[PDB]
Amino acid sequence: EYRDTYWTPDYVPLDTDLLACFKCTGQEGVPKEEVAAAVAAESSTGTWSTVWSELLVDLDFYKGRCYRIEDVPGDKEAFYAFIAYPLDLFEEGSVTNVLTSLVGNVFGFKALRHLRLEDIRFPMAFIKTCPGPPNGICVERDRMNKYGRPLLGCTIKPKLGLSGKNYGRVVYECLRGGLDFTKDDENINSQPFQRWQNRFEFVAEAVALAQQETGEKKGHYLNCTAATPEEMYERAEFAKELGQPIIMHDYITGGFTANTGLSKWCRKNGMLLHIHRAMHAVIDRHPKHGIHFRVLAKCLRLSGGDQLHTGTVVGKLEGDRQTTLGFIDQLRESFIPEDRSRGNFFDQDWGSMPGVFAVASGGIHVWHMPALVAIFGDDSVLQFGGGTHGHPWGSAAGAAANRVALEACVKARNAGREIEKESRDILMEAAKHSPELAIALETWK
Amino acid sequence: EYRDTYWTPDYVPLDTDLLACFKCTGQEGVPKEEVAAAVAAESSTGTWSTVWSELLVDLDFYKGRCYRIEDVPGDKEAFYAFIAYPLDLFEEGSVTNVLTSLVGNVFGFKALRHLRLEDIRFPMAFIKTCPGPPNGICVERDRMNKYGRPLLGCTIKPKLGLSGKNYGRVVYECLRGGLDFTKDDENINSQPFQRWQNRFEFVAEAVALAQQETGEKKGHYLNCTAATPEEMYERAEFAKELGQPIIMHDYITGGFTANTGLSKWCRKNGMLLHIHRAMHAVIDRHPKHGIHFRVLAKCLRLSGGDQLHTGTVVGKLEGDRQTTLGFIDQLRESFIPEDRSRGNFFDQDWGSMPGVFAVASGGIHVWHMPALVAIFGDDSVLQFGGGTHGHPWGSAAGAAANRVALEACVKARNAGREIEKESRDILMEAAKHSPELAIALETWK
Amino acid sequence: EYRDTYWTPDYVPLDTDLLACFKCTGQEGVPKEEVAAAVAAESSTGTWSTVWSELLVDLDFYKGRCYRIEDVPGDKEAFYAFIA
Amino acid sequence: VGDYQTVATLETFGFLPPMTQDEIYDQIAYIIAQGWSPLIEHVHPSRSMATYWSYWKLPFFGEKDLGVIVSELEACHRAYPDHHVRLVGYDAYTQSQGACFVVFEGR
Amino acid sequence: VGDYQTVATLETFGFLPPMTQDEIYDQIAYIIAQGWSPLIEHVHPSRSMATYWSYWKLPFFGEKDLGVIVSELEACHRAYPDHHVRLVGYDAYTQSQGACFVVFEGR
């Protein structure tokens, strides 16, 4: 029994503590308080019998406190548990240390059928310790001089096979159509068919040419995720020398340590950082067990970064857009009030620490854009890899069609109109001056 | 009793000695010679009883000599004391060592009601040892190609809150109006709302744009005062790479060591150094105790630097402009004759070591400019933070109005006219071609 | 007058604020609240007349708050001022 | 069938035909409804790649009337009828441009 | 009300209207009274950003007459009536320019 020292019936968390929410399912017919206290201890302290060395350090002060067990709305065996953590249990600005101390060993205890990390309330102190995003939302907007509308990206299709020249010319064709950015594929950094130096050189040349032609500050997302941190820094500095204003990375596969180092280097060198969520589903695909994507989003925002992939939710699955908009709030706003429907179990304030852009990509094209604008607001980016490329008139025409669709949609939204219902009229009116938009809307009606 | 070995009734200082003036007030009814000798010893040597190790080194040669006690004109309890110092008691070009040896422990002796350091006569040798200002007055004028008139600056208001783009555009608006420079705020180096890299980049871009537009070599004061010397050097070299011709620093808060290192780096890299006197008042606000600002000005000039803040004296307090003009003389001229009214107690010669520009800022605007020109001469800079920004027509119009006011004032001064009396006619005649000047003079009549 | 925006009669400091104590002596016969607010502003913000650029950033949030004036035990002209 | 020629466009509504005056009214009304502030920028088209354009009279804070904004727009258009003229909404609380687009394009 | 347009000005009295001849007399008399030496510089306006302009005849040391200075000024103005022409007072003891301003501006 561990409730007596790791379950607190009347404790109130301190404003400097780290508060964690776990959706817990113990074995059948077990005390919920006991399993919650077991989880809390397994996060900090665990012994199989009487021990000696724990009397040389005050275990009372350096221990977690589960202070509230609430009944989950939908399952009476699953319950939300709120565990506190003294500030001293972590490193000053190490998201890696937070993950190690939170999920390092708790998932291995046999007395828990399922465990899911739901929400984390980071104290203001720990947030002020971490480097945070190198640029921020408003700073990125200033560096790109783009406002009024969300930004427009696209993944370079096919997933691989392109040489440096071919990849560069495809990126140029996508970019010259008014598209804001292009992202390299998450699994493509350096290949036998394509060495990264050639791709970076050709894509920098293409970006410069498109920037000169269209009269707009443009850029492409360059990937630095690689085998070693030395190679990552080398590629990042090579991109810096080539005048490219943004680079991209995979923080889960590369690592939280690598992501933090890359963000610090970007701040030290004045570079923008794009991030993709590769392998996030392996942690959040299961709706009952694992780690919710909001926790990963919080960790990435603390570790630094300017963009984070989300999908929207819509296009294939109407789903539960409430919690998606909730993590969007946690991505953009400095403070977010509690919202059980949005999956926000704590009053979380970020002080004046700049937020992170949201990335919506995958299974989307022109027909979805009004709802995407409505749900994601103006602080987001939309990527249409196949849609822009699969347009019969070419990638440039597809990008132009999506750009004018976005312009018309944001104009109608600024007009004070409910875009979701009359979206068909909006797209028809836009097509009255863009035949490529008309044929695109015809393709995927 | 220490007079017998630390009071010299007939000693004449050697031309290689360091001469210091202290305004001293001992306890009531104490020997003035005894307290002066106590101060002199407490600067070099102090023992509570008979000692042994002092017989292994000649204490006679390595000891200070107070050689003259003069009655202060205004208090008969306060007296001026002149203490000599053998050249060997200091480091070859360390103002830090001078301050440690002069005020390190003397201010803690109970036998002194008050102690104030008034004047220091630095020997020519010690001046030749120190690095000195990296550029100098004439060299700065050559590097800016600005002559005939004093230069015109302004602090960027508000004190903080600006992003990189906003700060840069405000600096550009101030600069394009003919303003010579702009100084960042002394307490603003790197903030959560504004990282220094973005501010430096945007302000460099704005300075380049304004320089291209107005057809004049311009610049902004960039601050490198930070937490560590490594960060200071990094920011200075970043400014050097961005083609910015001047950087600024706070020598008291940052430190004399940091100021000397920054000046040496500026000389080694061909950079101009601006300095603000933050926290100087905490040392000189009290008129009877502390260190007079002339001593700090001497120390900064020895440690290196191109500009030093002074106020003028006028605008709020008519005061005692005599001693202010005295320290101005000590800031500009190579030699200065003794002047008791100006607070110059020694015949101080700087050889051919270039002087330092004077900075007049705070509580000043267009109405004061004629008197400012009259008192500060042509080797000074005028800053109007609120006045230029608070002008209803904008910062550019206010800067242009101040520029044309300065031009008209220096023209009338060169005409052989007494500017102080007919200043109203001068400003009216200037307003006969500058309506912004007219409305400014209307605002603060 | 700067009390209206830099003297807070009923503000309670936030636990993330920086609190400073100043023993202040203004000129004779001056409002203690006014001089405390002047010190607080002179730490953050100071203008001699109406200004424009301060409307592009929220001066309300980025400003100090003197929230308590206490009488010094020993001098009635000197007073302790607590600025946030 | 057919190609899309590259066009020197003007930053978010550079693609669409020039906005009508009623659309300008709606845009400025939206800027008012968001608590932002109007600001007029004009610059020679040759220098479109610059970072800061030549600003008109200082941004109007507390101004909630469309007519004065339209009068200022037409006055600045007559001031430089060959420059590119755009209208920007400034947000003080976020230090960014809430919305911006070109109103008049030069000859 | 109204804006102040950016003007390509000419370095300390570039803003004021061109000086009258009596004002030139007063300026050169002041230069004489300060012990400085007159020096005439002319350069094409396209190269105003250069560091050294094309100097006229060598600086006149010991010259204390205004009329010869005016004659040299008008002669150099007629030499290059399309160049910017300025007058500079040189101080030997400080190795700086005591006073300098433009006299004739090019077409």
Nearest to E12 by CA among B331, B375, B378: B378
Give B221→chain D minimum CA distance, Å.
Answer: 20
D45-74 b/e (C-beta count within 10 Å ≥ 16 → b): eeebeebbbbbbebbeeeeeebeebeebbe
C-alpha span between D42 and D78 (Å, rounded): 11
Please report the resolution in angstroms: 3.8
The class level of CATH for B137-444 reads alpha beta
User: CA B305 to CA A303: how far, in whole Å?
Assistant: 40
CA A29 to chain centre: 38
Chains touching E by CB (3 or more pairs below 8 Å): B, D
Tokens of E83: 């160049």
Q: A touches E (3+ CB pairs < 8 Å)? A: no
Phi and psi for A24 in degrees, rounded to 5?
A: -115, 140
Question: Are C47 and B146 a contacting pair, CB within 8 Å?
Answer: no
Q: What's the Rg (C-alpha) of chain B?
A: 24
Show the tokens assigned to D99. 């919305």
Containing H/E element for E64? Answer: none
The answer to whether the CB of B23 falls within 8 A of the CB of B291 is: no
SS3 call for B139: helix
Residue range(s) in chain A whose domain bears CATH number 3.30.70.150: 3-129
Method used to solve the structure = cryo-EM
Q: Tokens 């009508």, residue? A: D20
Burial of A231 (0-12, 13-18, 19+ CB in 10 A): middle
| Catalytic option among A128, A146, A157, A240 | A157
Cα–Cα nearest to C25, from C74, C84, C67:
C74
CA distances from A260 to A95, A101, A186, A233, A264 (A): 8, 18, 18, 12, 6
Contact D57 E6 (CB under 8 A): no
Q: Enter the CATH code of domain C3-84.
A: 3.30.70.150
SS3 B246: strand
Instruction: Tell which residue, A354, A332, A366, A376, has the closest CA to residue A150.
Output: A376
Is A213 annotated in some ligand binding site? no
E strands along B207-310, which residues? 222-223, 246-250, 272-276, 290-291, 307-309
Cβ burial, residue C61 (10 Å; 0-12/13-18/19+): exposed
CATH topology of domain B3-129: Alpha-Beta Plaits (3.30.70)
Least Cα distance to B292 among B254, B314, B315, B320 occurs for B320
Distance between CA atoms of residues B200 and A208, nearest Å: 24
Q: CB distance D8–A414 less than 8 Å?
A: no
Residue in B355, B358, B362 with CA at minimum distance from that of residue B375 = B358
- B335 within 8 A of B349, measured Cβ to Cβ: yes
On whether any CB of chain D is under 8 Å from the CB of B436, the answer is no
CA distance B44 to B100: 11
Cα–Cα distance for residue pair C21/B444, rounded to 1 Å: 34
CA distance B235 to chain A (A): 10
C-beta separation of D89 from D61 below 8 A: no
Q: How far is residue E73's CA from residue E38's CA, in Å, rounded to a whole number?
A: 10
Cα–Cα distance, B274 to B246 (Å, whole number): 7
- Which residue numbers come right before each break in chain B (C to N over 2.5 Å)? none
Q: What 3-state DSSP class applies to E37?
A: strand
* Residue B368 among known ligand-binding residues: yes
How many CB atoms are located within 10 Å of the residue A19 CB? Answer: 22
Task: Give the gap in angstroms from C-alpha E7 to the nearest C-alpha of chain B.
Answer: 7
Three-state DSSP class for residue B383: strand
CA B145 to chain centroid, in Å, comes to 23
Q: Please provide the DSSP assignment of B8-48 as one string.
A: -SS----TTSEEEEEEEEESTT--HHHHHHHHHHHHH---S
C-alpha pair distances (Å), A186 with each of A133, A248, A301, A361: 20, 9, 19, 13
- Note the residue count of chain C: 84
- What is the three-class DSSP state of B443? helix
Report d(CA A360, CA A308) in Å as an integer.
Answer: 9
Give the phi and the psi of residue A115 in degrees, each rounded to 5: -140, 135
B321-327 contact pairs (CB < 8 A, 24+): B321/B375, B323/B294, B324/B375, B325/B375, B326/B294, B327/B293, B327/B294, B327/B297
Check if the beta carbon of residue B162 is closer than 8 Å to that of residue A138: no
Residue B341 neighbours by CB distance under 10 Å: 11
What's the rounded Cα separation, in Å, for the pair A396 and A407? 16
Say how many CB pairs under 8 Å bridge A and B. Answer: 20
Report the residue of chain E nearest B394, measured CA to CA: E3
How far apart are alpha carbons E19 and A442 in whole angstroms?
72
At position B435, the amino acid (one-letter code) is P
Q: What is the 3-state secondary structure (H, E, C) of chain A?
A: CCHHHHECCCCCCCCCCEEEEEEEEECCCCCHHHHHHHHHHHHHCCCCCCCCHHHCCCCCCCCCEEEEEEECCCCCCCEEEEEEECHHHCCCCCHHHHHHHHHCCHHHCCCEEEEEEEEEECCHHHHHHCCCCCCCHHHHHHHHCCCCCCEEECECCCCCCCCHHHHHHHHHHHHCCCCCCCECCCCCCCECCECHHHHHHHHHHHHHHHHHHHCCCCCCEEECCCCCHHHHHHHHHHHHHCCCCEEEEEHHHHCHHHHHHHHHHHHHHCCEEEEECCCCHHHHCCCCCEECHHHHHHHHHHHCCCEEECCCCCCCCCCCHHHHHHHHHHHHCCEECCECCCCECCCEECCCCCCCEEEEECCCCHHHHHHHHHHHCCCEEEECHHHHHCCCCCHHHHHHHHHHHHHHHHHHHHCCCCCCCCHHHHHHHHHCCCHHHHHHHHHCC
Nearest to B147 by CA among E53, E88, E9, E60: E88
Task: Report the alpha-carbon distance of residue A171 to residue A154 in Å, rounded.
Answer: 9
Residue that has been written with the tokens 């009606």 in this structure: A445
User: How many angstroms separate the Cα of A326 from the Cα of each of A254, A323, A331, A337, D94?
Assistant: 27, 5, 9, 10, 21
Eight-class DSSP state of C9: S
List the structure tokens of A188: 């493509």
What CA–CA distance (Å, rounded) separates A343 from A322? 8
Residue type, A102: L
Rounded to the nearest angstrom, the gap between the alpha carbon of residue B131 and the centroid of all alpha carbons in its chain is 17
What gap in Å lies between CA A428 and CA A440, rounded to an integer? Answer: 11
Q: How far apart are the first and last CA of chain A?
A: 61
* Cα three-residue angle A15-A18-A22, rounded to 5 degrees: 125
- B388 and B396 Cβ atoms separated by less than 8 Å: no
Provide the chain B residues 105-134 that lie in CB contact (below 8 A) with chain E: none
Residue A57: how many other CB atoms lie within 10 Å: 9
Gap between the Cα atoms of C60 and C54, Å rounded: 10
- CA gap D29, D23 in Å, rounded: 10
Among candidates B306, B314, B361, B357, which has minimal Cα distance to B186?
B361
Terminal Cα distance for chain B, rounded? 61
List, as one string, the DSSP characters of D83-98: SEEEEEEEETTTTEEE
Q: Which two tokens stand for residue B65?
A: 């000599």
In 3D space, the residue among A372, A443, A434 whose CA is nearest the CA of residue A397 turns out to be A434
Residues of C contacting chain A (CB within 8 angstroms): 15-16
Q: Is A165 a catalytic residue?
A: no
E3-27 core/surface letters (b: 16 or more CB in 10 A; e: else): bbebeebbbbbbbbeebeeeebebb
Helix (H) or strand (E) holding E84: strand E84-91
Q: Where in chain B is the domain with CATH 3.20.20.110?
A: 137-444
Between the alpha carbon of residue B303 and those of residues A49, B135, B141, C21, the distances in Å are: 67, 13, 20, 34
Tokens 């202070």, residue located: A67
- Measured at the alpha carbon of residue B42, what is the angle toward residues B41 and B45, in degrees to the nearest 5? 60
Supply the DSSP symbol for E59.
P
Q: Where are the beta strands (DSSP E) in D3-91?
A: 37-43, 54-55, 84-91
Of B29, B26, B267, B20, give the one whose Cα is nearest residue B140: B267
Tell me if residue A276 is catalytic.
yes
Nearest Cα neighbor of A111 from A220, A3, A27 is: A27
Report DSSP state, residue D54: E
CB B32 within 8 A of CB B69: yes
- Using alpha carbons, select from C5, B377, B62 the residue that is nearest to residue E98: B377
Query: Is A133 within 8 Å of A297 (Cβ atoms)?
Result: no
- From first CA to last CA, the distance across chain E in angstroms is 32
Task: Residue A340: name the closest of A122, A123, A119, A76 by CA.
Answer: A119
